[PDB]
């Protein structure tokens, strides 16, 4: 409640009815409550609880770092990282960060347009640190052929079928999820053949409702 | 040599570079038939001649009970563990035992100081059921 930004005000007034409108014009989300309004009932799943330490004169300062993945099972996903002194708060802090880090997931078919969309449209590669995760489209029957760490994330994004090939120090849990989030992130940035058409001209929600937000 | 007719060097390079594989060279060169007390055999039989106790490594404390075995096929002298609790009292002397490996660890394994073999029978049934 109590929005601060324009997009926060617009969604509270119920003028931006779909999250896809925000993704259409590339508007940054700065309040996690915006995602709560537009994507209700998001499933949750905490990837890991890694504890870091900083050496001090009096000893060590242990903080808990939480990797949480959020996203509805219909093509949206988000990954957020937060570290703090308490496990309960760190999850809550990473809970917020996951919501502002929502990204669209473009998925397609394997060989024909029959049924609903199940798999990625082309080959995508995550570009984290030494870890690199490749996703390949797969037929209908095959599940998410992947390690448990990115399988948990890919389940949330709604990708039912995929083939994976990982490379690097995949034992690094944080980079393993980050690499998957990166391959998914650029799904809508890779221009395939069907996206050649420029389509029509659409009005930005911040310009059509610029007057009301001022008043 | 990534050319279309460059198959001689590509095939010859893999022959030379494969000899640097520590795990693969060991299984090919002639050492399993001369430097392996067990040999190719999975299990071996021998005669117990001495009951030994080996101290463990520095971060551990205690005495690892074990036996000294003289194999039949070769005639070499080895050392063999005595699995679980109090199984050395079940092992007699100048009798036949079945000796069978361990995992392989970093080569040596579980009685610490260089032992790599574990007694699985005492003539009898098992230095398990026994």
């Amino acid at each position: 409640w109590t929005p601060v930004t324009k997009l926060g005000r617009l969604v509270k007034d119920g003028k931006v009815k779909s999250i896809d409108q925000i993704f259409e014009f590339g508007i940054k989300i700065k309040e996690y409550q915006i995602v709560d309004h537009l994507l209700p009932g998001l499933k949750e799943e905490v990837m890991t609880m890694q504890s870091v330490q900083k050496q001090t004169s009096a000893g060590q300062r242990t903080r808990l770092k939480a990797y949480v993945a959020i996203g509805d099972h219909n093509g949206h996903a988000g990954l957020g990282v937060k570290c703090a002194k308490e496990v309960a708060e760190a999850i809550k802090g990473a809970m917020i960060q996951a919501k502002l880090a929502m990204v669209p997931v473009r998925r397609g078919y394997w060989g024909a347009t029959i049924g609903e969309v199940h798999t990625v449209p082309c080959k995508l590669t995550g570009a984290c640190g030494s870890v690199r995760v490749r996703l390949v489209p797969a037929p209908r029957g095959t599940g998410i052929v992947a390690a448990p760490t990115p399988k948990k994330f890919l389940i949330l994004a709604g990708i039912e079928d995929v083939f994976t090939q990982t490379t690097g120090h995949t034992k690094t849990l944080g980079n393993f999820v980050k690499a998957t989030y990166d391959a998914v992130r650029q799904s809508y940035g890779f221009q395939t053949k069907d996206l050649w058409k420029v389509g029509g001209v659409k009005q930005s929600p911040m310009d059509k409702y610029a007057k009301i937000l001022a008043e | 040599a990534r050319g279309l007719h460059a198959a001689r060097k590509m095939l010859a390079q893999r022959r030379a570079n494969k000899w640097a594989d520590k795990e693969w060279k060991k299984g090919k060169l002639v050492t399993r038939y001369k430097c392996n007390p067990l040999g190719t055999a999975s299990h071996a039989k021998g005669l117990v001649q001495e009951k030994l106790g080996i101290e463990t490594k520095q971060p551990n404390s205690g005495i690892r009970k074990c036996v000294r075995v003289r194999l039949l096929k070769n005639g070499k002298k080895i050392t063999a563990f005595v699995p679980r609790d109090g199984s050395l009292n079940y092992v007699n002397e100048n009798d036949e035992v079945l000796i069978s490996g361990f995992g392989r660890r970093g080569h040596a394994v579980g009685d610490i100081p260089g032992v790599r073999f574990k007694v699985v029978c005492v003539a009898g049934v098992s230095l398990w059921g026994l």
Partner: protein, 71 residues
Amino acid sequence: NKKIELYIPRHCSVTHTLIAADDHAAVQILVPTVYTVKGSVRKDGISDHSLNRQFQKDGFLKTVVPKNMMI
């Protein structure tokens, strides 16, 4: 049944490439028509010149871009 695309992405008016949802440097200039510039073009120091070509194409400018550059 349901539409297979989440949304139809915008096309940069300069490089004719898609504008990613995470591209937080991509702008939209309204000339009382819509012009979209990708974030990569802006950071390179060229979006000013690229818009000059497009502005001259649509008539908003006449004697800015020379003929040999008018492509």
